[PDB]
Amino acid sequence: RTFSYTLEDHTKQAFGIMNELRLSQQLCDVTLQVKYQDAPAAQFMAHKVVLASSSPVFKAMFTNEQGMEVVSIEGIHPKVMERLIEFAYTASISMGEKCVLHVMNGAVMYQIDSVVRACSDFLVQQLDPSNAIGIANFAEQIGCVELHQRAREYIYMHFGE
Amino acid sequence: HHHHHHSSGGNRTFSYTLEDHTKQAFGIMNELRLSQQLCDVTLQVKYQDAPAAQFMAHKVVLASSSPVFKAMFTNGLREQGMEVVSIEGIHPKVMERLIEFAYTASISMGEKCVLHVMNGAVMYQIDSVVRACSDFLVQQLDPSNAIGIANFAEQIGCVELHQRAREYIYMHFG
Numbered sequence: 001r002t003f004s005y006t007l008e009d010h011t012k013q014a015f016g017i018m019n020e021l022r023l024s025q026q027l028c029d030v031t032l033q034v035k036y037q038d039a040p041a042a043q044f045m046a047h048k049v050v051l052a053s054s055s056p057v058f059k060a061m062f063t064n065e066q067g068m069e070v071v072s073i074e075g076i077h078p079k080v081m082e083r084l085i086e087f088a089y090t091a092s093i094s095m096g097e098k099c100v101l102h103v104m105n106g107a108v109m110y111q112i113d114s115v116v117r118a119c120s121d122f123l124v125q126q127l128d129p130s131n132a133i134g135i136a137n138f139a140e141q142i143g144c145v146e147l148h149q150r151a152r153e154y155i156y157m158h159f160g161e
Numbered sequence: 162h163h164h165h166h167h168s169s170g171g172n173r174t175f176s177y178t179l180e181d182h183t184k185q186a187f188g189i190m191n192e193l194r195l196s197q198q199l200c201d202v203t204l205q206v207k208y209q210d211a212p213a214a215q216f217m218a219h220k221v222v223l224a225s226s227s228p229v230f231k232a233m234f235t236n237g238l239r240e241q242g243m244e245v246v247s248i249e250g251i252h253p254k255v256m257e258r259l260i261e262f263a264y265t266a267s268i269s270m271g272e273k274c275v276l277h278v279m280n281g282a283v284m285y286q287i288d289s290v291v292r293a294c295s296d297f298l299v300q301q302l303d304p305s306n307a308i309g310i311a312n313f314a315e316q317i318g319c320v321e322l323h324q325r326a327r328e329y330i331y332m333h334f335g
């Protein structure tokens with residue numbers, strides 16, 4: 001008859017090693033160059049296949065061919081991209097409250113929907129009269145319909161509307 | 162160096178983990194393997210009286226599941242195209258099962274295949290498969306097979322299987 005084995009946390013151990021390889025700059029076939037405003041240029045080595053596995057945008061980019069590619073990024077802060085890359089390689093992201101808007105914007109641009117959803121839910125929790133308008137505005141700018149609606153609903157509710 | 166161009170328009174802590182992210186990601190990495198997309202390695206596998214086989218894969222995924230593949234591919238030249246690696250002394254179906262494990266975390270095979278796979282797993286230091294195979298054979302330990310299994314363990318280099326088998330024999334005599 002049949003011998004069948006599953007290692008539950010194999011994908012975690014494997015991502016651990018893929019992250020080690022990233023930081024050692026081993027087997028990296030993509031370089032992300034990030035330029036923001038009047039800030040120093042930042043460079044991030046990574047593996048196309050790991051990026052494609054976490055982002056439909058990277059998947060579309062790289063499946064549409066063998067050799068180092070450079071992706072030049074403008075108007076995104078290096079620490080935003082570093083946080084998204086670390087998410088792709090670890091499944092985790094941790095940051096100050098003031099970072100959430102810039103990261104959610106990053107996440108949207110590379111369709112890391114789970115991070116968009118995490119950021120969105122967080123801001124809906126933090127809604128108050130001071131921030132409601134800014135958040136609503138931001139939501140409209142970056143195109144997050146659900147965050148915009150929750151924020152607009154929270155504002156017009158203060159006027160029995 | 163094919164270039165891409167992307168342009169853009171209190172004190173509480175935010176932290177998020179997507180529990181099954183590595184599973185979803187491996188799902189897509191496996192999809193990409195079977196569609197032969199983003200693959201940078203082709204394994205050519207040749208063994209005894211069996212037909213030549215090709216397996217396309219991603220060096221980084223193989224290296225993440227096998228220290229031998231990791232050593233192989235970090236010792237190879239950088240900015241290489243597709244690389245073709247000749248492999249000998251492992252049967253294509255053994256390597257196919259190990260690759261599928263690397264990409265899915267699961268392995269299934271006939272009971273009679275366990276020895277050839279465990280041998281494969283040891284050769285490429287896929288230790289969790291070695292451990293799985295070993296524990297299975299330890300379940301089969303009896304007076305008839307204890308010696309054969311102990312011998313096998315020594316042949317293929319599996320320390321844990323050899324010790325568990327020798328420990329089972331020493332229980333009768335010491």
Ligand SMILES: *c1nc(S(=O)(=O)c2ccccc2Cl)c(N2CCN(C)C(=O)[C@H]2C)s1
Nearest residue numbers: 077078079080095096097098099100102103
């Ligand atoms: C959390 N992240 C940052 S950041 O990554 O340093 C950053 C800098 C500039 C633009 C966007 C981001 Cl996410 C934070 N900040 C760093 C300090 N600072 C001057 C900020 O304005 C603030 C956003 S919060």
Ligand SMILES: *c1nc(S(=O)(=O)c2ccccc2Cl)c(N2CCN(C)C(=O)[C@H]2C)s1
Nearest residue numbers: 211252254255270271272273274275277278
């Ligand atoms: C389970 N798998 C196989 S196999 O994949 O067909 C194979 C062929 C040749 C060498 C190694 C393997 Cl794993 C089995 N076999 C090994 C025993 N045997 C006598 C076979 O011919 C073959 C079916 S068992």
